[PDB]
Amino acid sequence: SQIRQNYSTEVEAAVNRLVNLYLRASYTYLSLGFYFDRDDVALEGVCHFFRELAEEKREGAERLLKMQNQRGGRALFQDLQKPSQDEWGTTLDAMKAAIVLEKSLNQALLDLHALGSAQADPHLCDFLESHFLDEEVKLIKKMGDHLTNIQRLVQAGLGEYLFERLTL
Amino acid sequence: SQIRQNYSTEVEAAVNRLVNLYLRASYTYLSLGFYFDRDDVALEGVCHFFRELAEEKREGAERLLKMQNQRGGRALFQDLQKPSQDEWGTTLDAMKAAIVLEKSLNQALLDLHALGSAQADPHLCDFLESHFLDEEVKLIKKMGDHLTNIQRLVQAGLGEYLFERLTL
Amino acid sequence: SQIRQNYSTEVEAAVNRLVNLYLRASYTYLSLGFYFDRDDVALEGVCHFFRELAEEKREGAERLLKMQNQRGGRALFQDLQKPSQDEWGTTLDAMKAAIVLEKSLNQALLDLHALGSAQADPHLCDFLESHFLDEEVKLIKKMGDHLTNIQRLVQAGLGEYLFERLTL
Amino acid sequence: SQIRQNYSTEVEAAVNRLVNLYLRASYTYLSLGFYFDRDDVALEGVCHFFRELAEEKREGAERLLKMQNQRGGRALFQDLQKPSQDEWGTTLDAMKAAIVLEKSLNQALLDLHALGSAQADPHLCDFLESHFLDEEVKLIKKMGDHLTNIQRLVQAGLGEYLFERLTL
Amino acid sequence: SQIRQNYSTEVEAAVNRLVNLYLRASYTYLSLGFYFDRDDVALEGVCHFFRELAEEKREGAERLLKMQNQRGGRALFQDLQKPSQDEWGTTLDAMKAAIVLEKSLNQALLDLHALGSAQADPHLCDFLESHFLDEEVKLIKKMGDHLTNIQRLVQAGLGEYLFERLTL
């Protein structure tokens, strides 16, 4: 590539893998959102919380793909595996699964950052720091806060309703 | 009728029956609304929910009557039977009765649509699709969502109060 | 499902399959868009055309999923297969592949409509007519118009540049 | 210097060298810009593209000089060598020379970043990441995109005219 | 007719013939417009040019009919013959056919003017001069200008595209 400079094949491949992970996360949140939209679940605030996160993760994937091209790397797409569950249980179960998912994404970001540092690729390192690392930390804090409030509240039915009405 | 075209006597009669069903539904919701306005019931949000539905069903009847005339059919009115109950119990009981009522109206709309299709009357079919069928589907979804939230909430007194305050 | 009425298991399954087809189409257009963003391809108008279509197809999938829930059906997600190509060649090649993809989606919509008609499900039939069928017809017309103009223009390099600058 | 802290003589010297490189780049772009303003060249969009870049590179030099003083280092200026060419040939030749120049600047920024990291000078590292590294990556991507479009277009005279009119 | 004054049967008949000629011209331009809207032709600017002319010619017919009544003559309508072609070939072919059509209309206007002069009917003469004769001269000039530019441009495919994009 005429523009490619200081951009290792290892980082290029890892960025494609991270795109897949972000799209998979978006898909998982799409599934979560529509599950809470079921008439036998019916927690609209929880549905909206996860649909927003689906959009965020898709946007993160697109930012990665834009960066791949800016550096002269080549986007390669793989199958997107379906989410791990078809039904997501309670808001508590769903929020635990979301924090698991975000921690996995954060770990992938940290692994890529370490790779970038080992490859002396400061543009990559700054990109991740600037657009992804703090967003993950803030989101995980928010989920942990939500989990604590959900747990405090669970008369589990009343608790789930109040959390959805008064927090989300 | 000088304007009547492709409008079968069977559809004409069925449209008059559906008008009666919609007015009956309006009357039922009028009864539901004022029951929740009783000082010994006193759930204003539930009263407002059903009074709004009374207005919607009356409006649906009027739309049917306007259509009857547009097609050159002749409106014929029958007695409006009183609602099935004088007292409607809890918000849960009332919402179950409302979903029963809406499903019966929806089934009548679907029967009329099938009639219209058998009579090759696409204006009727489009009219129903455009003004009634999706409105019923959306309303039934909303009632089902309400029922699920009511059920989750029912300390049944506290639950009924919170639903009325925070959802309705 | 408490709300489910006149909604066959066959339509429910077909709606889940159509969701997968729309998400796959979105993914294909995401791939198309970023390919035209490559520094060795560099046709920004073509990139924007396909990124817009990615968004449209995702939105169509979400509309289907919302409908699934409104009817009381249950969303089931499957793996999303990667797009058929990693590199998409010329704007001409890409627009031919897009018209192939849209025709396949349109055929799936028509198959589902026929199913809905056979199952006497007019809500489904109206839903498809109202939100999908005319959008597909308009989009295919636009692509065909684009293809004709691309073909007229292809000094193939000059042609591709002018189309991107003056049409897109 | 009373304020100097964690600022190595090696970085101080390298920052002065980078100032010279940025001023040299500004001078090169000044030459490029006025060449395209010649009546026997006459490509105003190309002239404007390079005059803008002259300003950008001068501004980058000034930002470096401001930083030098903020850290307590001492600006030292050297002769500014004249640009490598007196006449710059075609827009294609000029854009190739510009990408060569930007890659050399980017490599100098990366070398300085590596120096800063080896000297454990995170302020320097952040400064470069924040103000220079991403700007270079974006600019090189844009030049590469321009080069690809120029190449696609070159009836070379017609191509050069159209690029200047429709892209620049 | 109580109002009829200085309005010969010969002019009355000729005005009815000219109405037919203008409606025929409108129909021809309707055909031209939709031909350029075909997906295998796809020149939207050319389609718009001819659809506008269809409207102009219809309006001219209506102005003639209004005049017929103002003078106390009696509008008589004849069949409108279909346009001379089903497919109109290239923009060049179409613009040549349009100039042929406009010249025929102009000649009919000039013949009617001569008739009006021979019948000493200055109202008719002024009407034609004021509303039709200069409009035809301007339109024919514009078509001739278009033809010259089309001809200059025809790599005939590229030429047709550029004319549609940059002139129409």
Cα D132 off chain centre by: 10
Measured over all CA atoms, what is the biggest interatomic distance in chain C, rounded to whole angstroms? Answer: 64
Contact C6 B110 (CB under 8 A): yes
CA distance B61 to B52: 15
Give the experimental resolution in Å. 1.7
Contact E160 C152 (CB under 8 A): yes
For residue A8 the two structure tokens come to 């290792």
Domain range annotation of chain E = 1-168
For residue E43 the two structure tokens come to 């020149």
Contact C39 D141 (CB under 8 A): yes
Q: Which of D107, D129, D144 sits opposite A3 (nearest CB)?
A: D144
The candidate with the shortest Cα–Cα distance to E40, out of C152, C45, D127, is C152
Kindly list the residues from chain C whose CB atom is less than 8 angstroms away from the CB atom of residue D153.
Answer: 157-158, 161
Contact D162 C162 (CB under 8 A): yes
H or E element: which one contains C18?
A: helix C9-36
Neighbours of chain C (3+ CB pairs under 8 A): A, B, D, E
CA distance E87 to E80: 19
Give Rg (Cα) of chain A. Answer: 18
Distance from the C130 Cα atom to the nearest Cα atom in chain B, whole angstroms: 9
Sequence positions preceding breaks in chain B, C–N over 2.5 Å? 154
∠ Cα A36 A40 A44 (to 5°): 35
Nearest CA in chain A to D145: A3
Sequence positions preceding breaks in chain A, C–N over 2.5 Å? 154
Check if A120 contacts D (Cβ < 8 Å).
Answer: yes
Contact A75 C34 (CB under 8 A): yes
Q: Which of C27, C58, C76 sits opposite A77 (nearest CB)?
A: C27
The candidate with the shortest Cα–Cα distance to A122, out of C22, A130, C71, is A130
CA distance D14 to B143: 71
A163 to A30, A39, B46, D135, D152: CA distances (angstroms): 21, 18, 22, 45, 59
Kindly list the residues from chain D whose CB atom is less than 8 angstroms away from the CB atom of residue C160.
Answer: 152
Are the CB atoms for B25 and B140 separated by under 8 Å? no
Interface contacts A/D by beta carbons within 8 Å: 43
Neighbours of chain B (3+ CB pairs under 8 A): A, C
Kindly list the residues from chain D whose CB atom is less than 8 angstroms away from the CB atom of residue A120.
Answer: 110, 114, 117
Q: Half-sphere exposure (CA, 13 Å, Cβ side) for B91?
A: 33
CA distance C69 to C71: 5
Q: Is chain E adjacent to chain C, meaning 3+ CB pairs within 8 angstroms? A: yes
Report H helices in B39-133: 44-71, 91-118, 122-128
Are the CB atoms for A35 and C75 separated by under 8 Å? yes
Distance from the D152 Cα atom to the nearest Cα atom in chain C, whole angstroms: 5
H or E element: which one contains D51?
A: helix D44-71
Q: Which of A34, A58, A81 sits opposite C69 (nearest CB)?
A: A34
CATH number belonging to domain D1-168: 1.20.1260.10
User: Would you tell me which residues 145-164 of chain B have a C-beta closer than 8 angstroms to some C-beta of chain A?
Assistant: 145-146, 148-149, 151-153, 155, 158-159, 162-163
User: Would you tell me which residues 61-80 of chain B have a C-beta closer than 8 angstroms to some C-beta of chain C?
Assistant: none
Nearest CA in chain C to A61: C30
Residue set of the binding site of A for Fe cation? 52, 55-56, 59, 62
CA distance D135 to D63: 13
Distance from the A86 Cα atom to the nearest Cα atom in chain C, whole angstroms: 6
Check if A42 contacts C (Cβ < 8 Å).
Answer: no
C81 to A23, A54, C76, C103, C108: CA distances (angstroms): 12, 19, 15, 18, 17
Are the CB atoms for E40 and E100 separated by under 8 Å? no
Residue with tokens 């295919």: C140
Contact C42 D149 (CB under 8 A): yes
Are the CB atoms for C15 and C73 separated by under 8 Å? yes
Contact D103 A6 (CB under 8 A): no
Contact A161 B149 (CB under 8 A): yes
Indicate left, alpha or beta for B72 from its phi (over 0: left) and psi (-120 to 50: alpha). Answer: left
Are the CB atoms for B99 and C3 separated by under 8 Å? yes
For residue D3 the two structure tokens come to 């304020």
CA distance B130 to C122: 11
Are the CB atoms for C37 and C47 separated by under 8 Å? yes
Are the CB atoms for E8 and E16 separated by under 8 Å? no
Are the CB atoms for E164 and E91 separated by under 8 Å? yes
Distance from the D78 Cα atom to the nearest Cα atom in chain A, whole angstroms: 28
Are the CB atoms for E24 and C126 separated by under 8 Å? no
Burial of A118 (0-12, 13-18, 19+ CB in 10 A): exposed
Sequence positions preceding breaks in chain D, C–N over 2.5 Å? 154
Are the CB atoms for B117 and B8 separated by under 8 Å? no
DSSP 8-state secondary structure symbol assigned to residue D82? P
CB atoms near residue D120 (< 10 Å): 10
CA distance E27 to E24: 5
Check if A5 contacts C (Cβ < 8 Å).
Answer: no
A6 SS3 class: coil
Check if C89 contacts D (Cβ < 8 Å).
Answer: no
Residue with tokens 């009115």: B77
The DSSP annotation for chain E comes to -TT--S--HHHHHHHHHHHHHHHHHHHHHHHHHHHHTSTTT--HHHHHHHHHHHHHHHHHHHHHHHHHHHHT--------PPPS-S---SHHHHHHHHHHHHHHHHHHHHHHHHHHHHTT-HHHHHHHIIIIIHHHHHHHHHHHHHHHHHHHH--HHHHHHHHHHHT-
Distance from the A83 Cα atom to the nearest Cα atom in chain B, whole angstroms: 25
List A80's β-bridge partners, or say none. C80
CA distance B133 to C130: 13
Residue with tokens 């009263």: B47
Contact C123 B134 (CB under 8 A): yes
Kindly list the residues from chain A whose CB atom is less than 8 angstroms away from the CB atom of residue D122.
Answer: none
